[PDB]
């Protein structure tokens with residue numbers, strides 16, 4: 001349903017939909033603030049559902065699921081010249097651990113989305129974004145500050161969930177829509193046992209193929225250096241239809257944030273050069289326009305921004321308040337943003353293409369494809385260049 005050799009993915013993530021992220025939908029979390037005190041705000045979906053209880057969580061999430069993304073969004077995505085969406089979903093949509101606070105019902109909307117994709121000629125990855133125990137301790141895994149994916153029976157439970165996804169979505173029923181199943185989003189390589197992670201990836205690969213599925217298997221790079229995965233899941237070993245997903249940002253450390261715009265561009269261009277050298281098909285599955293970490297709660301609930309020297313012992317670079325509203329951005333910041341977007345687009349189209357994080361946010365413009373497009377900062381058509389050939393690819 002896709003030609004990974006000849007076609008380029010031009011896509012958006014449907015983030016914040018089936019896995020809550022505080023920075024993307026702060027309205028769901030802000031009612032728990034006590035004036036300026038954020039100490040009682042649940043930090044992740046696990047604690048949000050636990051605090052509300054099952055009845056309230058289901059009422060509020062049903063409303064969210066039914067309105068956040070609809071068929072109209074898919075029409076607009078097609079109209080903007082995009083050809084692809086990535087759909088994050090948590091393990092809890094399929095299976096609950098014994099005392100899990102999570103509520104279910106996401107699957108109904110996932111299946112509506114697959115139909116909306118079909119109708120609008122949009123292809124899809126399904127992405128397992130959160131595993132039991134957490135694979136990364138990020139709030140976007142569902143469970144912040146825990147790293148227990150490789151503990152106990154959590155890896156086994158994850159493989160059981162994947163087998164459900166494989167039987168439902170990796171077969172003939174959706175072979176015209178689903179062009180990849182991503183085994184696990186952003187496993188935090190540095191804190192994991194990498195040998196066990198590779199075994200997990202291999203078990204998932206083999207399990208899918210054993211169902212008779214020919215669906216591409218997408219592996220996230222686990223924050224390893226470019227080329228790390230070249231010798232894994234290879235044609236030499238009869239392993240085929242494998243894609244590596246690289247994520248790229250320049251905002252989650254003081255060193256990255258302090259780069260001037262030219263150096264930000266040089267780094268983006270180098271992402272392209274280095275991805276080209278790899279031996280698997282590869283796609284930039286998450287990236288954005290952000291040049292700051294100013295979005296409220298981007299680093300987590302009750303954590304500040306490195307950009308204004310309010311987190312992670314970073315030096316003050318500038319004040320975030322002026323940057324929260326795209327109408328208040330300086331001409332220079334708008335120009336820097338457009339340059340940065342174009343350099344990333346060129347870099348990522350140099351291999352398998354790109355998937356912007358994310359389609360929409362409530363009020364975080366750096367992270368919203370819609371907002372950037374409407375304000376003329378994301379090229380429309382997406383091939384438009386105000387700053388052509390910044391990287392010099394050949």
Ligand SMILES: OC[C@H]1O[C@@H](O)[C@H](O)[C@@H](O)[C@@H]1O
Nearest residue numbers: 239240241242243279280281
């Ligand atoms: O090397 C690029 C690609 O070649 C294809 O033949 C394989 O099936 C893929 O798994 C691989 O990513």
Ligand SMILES: OC[C@H]1O[C@@H](O)[C@H](O)[C@@H](O)[C@@H]1O
Nearest residue numbers: 138139140249252298299300
């Ligand atoms: O570890 C700090 C940050 O790392 C980034 O790579 C992730 O995208 C963020 O979610 C996380 O907050």
